[PDB]
């Protein structure tokens, strides 16, 4: 199918600079113009710039002339888009598109890249297990001080999905993160089944099982 | 010359049929399309050339574009088509995109949702190390505004709070949580602390103790 996947979120310091990747996939990669376009939290589309994938010929709106660079490189069918001197209102979502030959809108969209921008370091998190106060029972994890997003929680390896509700993160005053994720279970569960979160925060090659037991 | 006009919200009984309008300078003679924008996900080109439909779009979502103003139009509107609408146009004279400023649509008549609160006290390992963290939890409500205090033996308590805006759940309704720190000497201290939530004028408390 056509498809565009971006490059993972990433984190700068201020005035460091970013480069993103877009890897198109099920079509003629050169046929079409490339656009990045941004969406800052809360806000609407902007548009950024276009790229002419076959020749590299760039155009940009206003407001990203010059500190926004676009490339691409035919080979992996991957198009670059370069934020210089970075600045924290440049932390936004990162969106390349697919559009024009002849323009008939943007059909393809990539997932978006996040793009934060913050002093902040690296940092991996502490996690706490949530152990349960009937029918159903609320037991859960807390995922504690941590940079940057985003981290991954499953439970029990995998084996549980059904009643798993993963919170959007907390981003702290101390410039960390906190994030929790709990899990409804049966109340004859306790005590008898094994209940185990296995967190994982790739930027600090960090990898913690935890088990959550009853008080 | 090179400004896209949308109306910021629109809201639209189920069933009804809702319009969304995209102004511009001889829009009529320039080639417009639509966006809809769902929470955390990407944009969806609905409608492109003014009004041709992409596959996979059903026709409820139509198009036209005449003069100075080019519109989108939804039949039958179903809360699922709950969204951010953006037009565009490819701005000939300056070889520019440029995208409207978005509308927000709403579909009313949602029911309300009081939120579950669920409240985890700060762990023995937690305590161990120097943490200690109240832990709210709050799901399944409409409409997505809440007010969220924390107490502490009936006392105000806002030092050490930490709190999310509201997102939407799969099942489309609201999320948010509280975090609350505190020293183990702090925790230790009181009778209780307290996670107080306020949704729709009505509130909604949850405690723990040590």
């Known amino acids: 199918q056509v498809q565009l996947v971006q490059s993972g979120a990433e984190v700068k310091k201020p005035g460091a600079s970013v480069k993103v990747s877009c890897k198109a996939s099920?079509?003629?990669?050169?046929?079409?113009?490339m656009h990045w376009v941004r969406q800052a939290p809360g806000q609407g589309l902007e548009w950024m710039g276009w790229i002419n994938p076959n020749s590299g010929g760039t155009n940009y709106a206003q407001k990203f002339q010059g500190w926004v660079t676009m490339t691409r490189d035919t080979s992996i069918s991957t198009a670059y888009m370069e934020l210089s001197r970075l600045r924290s209102d440049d932390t936004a979502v990162y969106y390349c598109?697919?559009?024009?030959?002849?323009?008939?809108?943007?059909?393809?969209w990539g997932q978006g890249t996040t793009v934060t921008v913050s002093s902040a370091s690296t940092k991996g998190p502490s996690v706490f297990p949530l152990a349960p106060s009937g029918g159903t029972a609320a037991l859960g994890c807390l995922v504690k001080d941590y940079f940057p997003e985003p981290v991954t929680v499953s439970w029990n390896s995998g084996a549980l999905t059904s009643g798993v509700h993963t919170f959007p993160a907390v981003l702290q005053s101390s410039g960390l993160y906190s994030l929790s994720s709990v899990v409804t279970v049966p109340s004859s569960s306790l005590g008898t089944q094994t209940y185990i979160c296995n967190v994982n925060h790739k930027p600090s090659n960090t990898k913690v099982d935890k088990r959550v037991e009853p008080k | 010359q090179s400004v896209l006009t949308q109306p910021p919200s629109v809201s639209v009984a189920p069933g009804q049929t809702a319009r969304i309008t995209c102004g511009g300078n001889?829009?009529?003679?320039?080639?417009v399309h639509w966006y809809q924008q769902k929470p955390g996900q990407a944009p969806v080109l609905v409608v492109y050339?003014?009004?041709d439909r992409p596959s996979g779009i059903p026709e409820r979502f139509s198009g036209s574009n005449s003069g100075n103003t080019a519109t989108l139009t939804i039949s039958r509107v179903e809360a699922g088509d709950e969204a951010d609408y953006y037009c565009?146009?490819?701005?000939?004279?300056?070889?520019?995109?440029?995208f409207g400023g978005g509308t927000k649509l709403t579909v009313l008549g949602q029911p309300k949702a009081a939120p579950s609160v669920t409240l985890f006290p700060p762990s023995s390992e937690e305590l161990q190390a120097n943490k200690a963290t109240l832990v709210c939890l709050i799901s399944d409500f409409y409409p997505g505004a809440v007010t969220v205090a924390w107490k502490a033996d009936s006392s105000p308590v806002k030092a050490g709070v930490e709190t999310t805006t509201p997102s939407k759940q799969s099942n489309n309704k609201y999320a948010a949580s509280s975090y609350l720190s505190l020293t183990p000497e702090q925790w230790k201290s009181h009778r209780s602390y307290s996670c107080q939530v306020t949704h729709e004028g009505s509130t909604v408390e949850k405690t723990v103790a040590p």
């Open positions: 001889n829009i009529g003679s320039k080639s």
């Open positions: 598109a697919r559009g024009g030959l002849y323009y008939y809108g943007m059909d393809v």
């Open positions: 565009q146009v490819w701005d000939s004279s300056s070889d520019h995109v440029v």
């Open positions: 099920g079509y003629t990669f050169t046929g079409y113009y």
């Open positions: 050339d003014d009004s």
